Amino acid sequence: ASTSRLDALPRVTCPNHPDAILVEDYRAGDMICPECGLVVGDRVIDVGSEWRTFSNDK
Numbered sequence: 001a002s003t004s005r006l007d008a009l010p011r012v013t014c015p016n017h018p019d020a021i022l023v024e025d026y027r028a029g030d031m032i033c034p035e036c037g038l039v040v041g042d043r044v045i046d047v048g049s050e051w052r053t054f055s056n057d058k
């Protein structure tokens, strides 16, 4: 669906460890590499707000 900006982030892996996959949100941040624990990211835009719910009663 082309109704947004970023919705995948097809990165690659850790620069120090192309094997170890950086994790999303470093303890409330960007992409944390479990091995070097490096954090990458900042954008990701702000979408969390538009409706975001599970069906309604009305």
Ligand SMILES: [Zn+2]
Residues within 6 Å of the ligand: 014, 015, 016, 017, 020, 033, 034, 035, 036, 037, 038
């Ligand atoms: Zn690493």
